[PDB]
């Protein structure tokens, strides 16, 4: 399974089946046939496979990268420090890519789940998507195919000079 906080679903409210006609629908009989013929043998096979899993339990681990100094506190043309800064920046860039992918999945799942009233009932996912796309665009857009932490730092410093000039002219 997954975490319901990073992949949120609201609680499901299905209505009770209230038949008006006396004609029995084929869907309930086919659901009973799918329970007998399909779901129970698959369940038995998965229980067998899971017992064979439980006979030999072992683990893997999620790798933790400790934070090395970034590109701002590396001396210029010092490859032993700015190498580590660049590798850390590439891993942060790949993780930010996956964050934007998570928010896209949230947005698309909200659209399909809310169905016809999706424009009203998915304003929060749209707003979080807009914020994270704005942040990703201000951070990594237009760096080129030869992007680096130096390119990203230069873009950030250009944006900060533009913001400082815009603040100074508005005072």
């Amino acid at each position: 399974s997954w975490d319901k906080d990073v992949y949120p679903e609201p609680p499901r409210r299905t209505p009770a089946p209230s038949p008006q006609t006396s004609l029995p629908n084929p869907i309930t009989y086919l659901t009973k046939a799918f329970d007998l013929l399909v779901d129970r043998p698959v369940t038995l096979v998965r229980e067998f496979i899971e017992r064979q899993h439980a006979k030999n339990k072992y683990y893997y681990y999620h790798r933790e990268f400790r934070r090395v100094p970034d590109i701002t506190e590396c001396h210029e043309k010092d490859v032993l420090c700015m190498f580590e800064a660049e590798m850390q920046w590439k891993r942060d860039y790949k993780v930010d890519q996956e964050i934007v992918n998570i928010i896209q999945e949230r947005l698309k799942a909200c659209q399909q789940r809310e169905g016809e009233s999706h424009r009203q009932n998915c304003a929060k996912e749209l707003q979080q998507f807009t914020q994270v796309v704005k942040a990703y665009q201000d951070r990594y857009h237009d760096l080129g195919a030869h992007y680096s932490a130096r390119k990203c730092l230069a873009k950030q410093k250009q944006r900060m000079l533009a913001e400082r000039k815009a603040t100074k002219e508005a005072a």
Partner: protein
């Protein structure tokens, strides 16, 4: 389709433009004109997942018809009454829109007679 010939081949100053009307106030000619009553709650037609074209002033019959259409499955021919109720109230809404159109055309005739009377009087 005579109104197309009246607007295109006649004059268009007395004929109402479809894209921008009513150009007259809704109280212009009415003592205490009451609003249209919306039966279905906004949350009710929100939770019925109706199309936004279908969330008009007569969607409560549509909610009744869709609940009938769900509850009477597989007998798909068993909700003609609720369908005719919704179709009749959509018909009444269409008659109201025709009444708005004819009201605007008659008030443009009134304004035409007003300006001709003001030109002939003074």
């Amino acid at each position: 389709g005579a109104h197309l010939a009246r607007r295109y081949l006649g004059d268009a100053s007395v004929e109402p433009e479809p894209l921008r009307m009513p150009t007259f106030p809704p109280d212009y000619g009415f003592p205490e004109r009451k609003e249209r009553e919306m039966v279905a709650t906004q949350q009710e037609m929100n939770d019925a997942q109706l199309v936004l074209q279908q969330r008009d002033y007569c969607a409560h019959y549509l909610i009744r018809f869709l609940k009938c259409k769900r509850d009477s499955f597989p007998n798909f021919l068993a909700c003609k009454h609720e369908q005719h109720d919704w179709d009749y109230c959509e018909h009444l809404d269409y008659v109201k829109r025709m009444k708005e159109f004819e009201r605007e055309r008659r008030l443009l005739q009134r304004k035409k007679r007003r300006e001709q009377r003001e030109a002939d009087m003074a």
